[PDB]
Input
Amino acid sequence: KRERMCMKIENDCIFEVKLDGKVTGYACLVGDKVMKPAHVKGVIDNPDLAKLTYKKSSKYDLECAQIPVHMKSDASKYTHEKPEGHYNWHHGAVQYSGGRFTIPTGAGKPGDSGRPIFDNKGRVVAIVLGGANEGARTALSVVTWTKDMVTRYTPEGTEEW
Amino acid sequence: KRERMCMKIENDCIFEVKLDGKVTGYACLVGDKVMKPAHVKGVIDNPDLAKLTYKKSSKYDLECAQIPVHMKSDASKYTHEKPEGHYNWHHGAVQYSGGRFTIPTGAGKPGDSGRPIFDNKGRVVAIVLGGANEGARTALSVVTWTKDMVTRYTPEGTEEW
Output
């Protein structure tokens, strides 16, 4: 269940985007709210949440919604405490050292931005914004908080997916 | 399996300095930057790395340069930790106690400065600059940091190699 339980719990959470022959936006409902990278535009699949308005922050490019109760149980427990250990996601494990993320080059691809990541215990940690082809291990660009204050952590030269 | 994995670790990291029949300075890819003993003249072996400009220090006699965006795949973890024990270097183990890097007599020679002294666990600790023999032992002179504020230590009679 190191990743099978992850596959089961990630189901029904990530919502796809299909507007004109392209699938880019991946939105995850977590902590009574939801977010998506606003620098890339997407369309909400289900009409129930689509008609509801969303927040828009220019310098954080994330949205928000007031999700009702009939899908209230479609989120994680969102802990906030980060040792230096493997975390794993949909494509390969996660390497965390020196307060930073690194995934070897070619494991992912542009357009995969929006996939949330979460620990071995099943607790959500961050959502990837993009990365740049650095050597043999592409860095990441995610959001991390200490009980509050979501922050952007983008190394030098990162390129958005 | 005591030092071979380390020997693999610092492969492709140390560069060369040689202009006409002399090989002294050894640049180490530590902390997303390069440096070499300022007490000797340093000509960069790889033309790619020599395009950037470097900084100069008076007593710390070390340089710096923001690394390009495709050589972080060969970076150590360089975590600050100073216990007493054996850490090993390019030629044999190293004995450290009482804030003094010390080597058995005879294990040094001129033109070997710039060797990254690294811990037994695989993290680089410091860079070799110079030293001299004192009785049955030879002292060293390196740069260490307590998570910040790199410092310097120098015994009397020291000779830079």
About this structure: The radius of gyration of chain B is 15 Å.
